[PDB]
Design an enzyme around this catalytic site. Structure first.
Site, mmCIF file in Angstrom:
data_model
loop_
_atom_site.group_PDB
_atom_site.id
_atom_site.type_symbol
_atom_site.label_atom_id
_atom_site.label_comp_id
_atom_site.label_asym_id
_atom_site.label_seq_id
_atom_site.Cartn_x
_atom_site.Cartn_y
_atom_site.Cartn_z
ATOM 1 C CD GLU A 35 -3.184 -0.514 0.164
ATOM 2 O OE1 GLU A 35 -3.081 0.553 -0.458
ATOM 3 O OE2 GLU A 35 -4.138 -1.297 -0.032
ATOM 4 C CG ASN A 46 -8.261 7.146 -4.537
ATOM 5 O OD1 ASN A 46 -7.415 6.382 -4.937
ATOM 6 N ND2 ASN A 46 -8.468 7.359 -3.253
ATOM 7 C CG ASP A 48 -13.418 8.712 -5.100
ATOM 8 O OD1 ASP A 48 -12.239 9.054 -4.920
ATOM 9 O OD2 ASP A 48 -14.023 8.025 -4.272
ATOM 10 C CB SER A 50 -11.490 10.160 -1.794
ATOM 11 O OG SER A 50 -11.101 8.963 -2.426
ATOM 12 C CG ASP A 52 -6.227 5.986 -1.007
ATOM 13 O OD1 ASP A 52 -7.364 5.928 -0.523
ATOM 14 O OD2 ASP A 52 -5.987 5.694 -2.182
ATOM 15 C CG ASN A 59 -10.793 6.836 0.465
ATOM 16 O OD1 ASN A 59 -11.939 7.258 0.548
ATOM 17 N ND2 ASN A 59 -10.039 7.032 -0.592
#
Length: 129
Positions: A35, A46, A48, A50, A52, A59
């Site tokens: 990750e 991301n 959308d 958002s 991370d 998120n």
């Protein structure tokens, strides 16, 4: 801070992650590796909108507040920047809530695609734990 494999394993253990919700330590270390590559400062935006954050790429749409994710829920009650600290306590506390959310570790796409069903014990092999 970029953690060492065994260093992160020891911190995760001390924080109560080993076998938390049935997930052995190797799962958590493997997830961190893919990750964030063990980097507490990792961020990834991301499609959308958002983003991370941190060692476990939490998120902003549901768990933390970054002030720029319309409709964020902030379930861990913390600013996303807190997840980028060299002290992983906030990341661990929030992850515990995520993994307890119903889907288990499937919440982490890298875990699902690269750790799930593999010999995760390899990730703590050689560590003084």
């Amino acid at each position: 801070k970029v953690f060492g494999r065994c260093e992160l394993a020891a911190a995760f253990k001390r924080h109560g992650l080993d076998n938390y919700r049935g997930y052995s330590l190797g799962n958590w270390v493997c997830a961190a590796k893919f990750e964030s590559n063990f980097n507490t400062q990792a961020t990834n935006r991301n499609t959308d909108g958002s983003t991370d954050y941190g060692i476990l790429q939490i998120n902003s749409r549901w768990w933390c507040n970054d002030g720029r994710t319309p409709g964020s829920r902030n379930l861990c009650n913390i600013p996303c920047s807190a997840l980028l600290s060299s002290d992983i306590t906030a990341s661990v506390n929030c992850a515990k809530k995520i993994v307890s959310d119903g889907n288990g570790m499937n919440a982490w796409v890298a875990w699902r695609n690269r750790c799930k069903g593999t010999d995760v014990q390899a990730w703590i092999r050689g560590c003084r734990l």
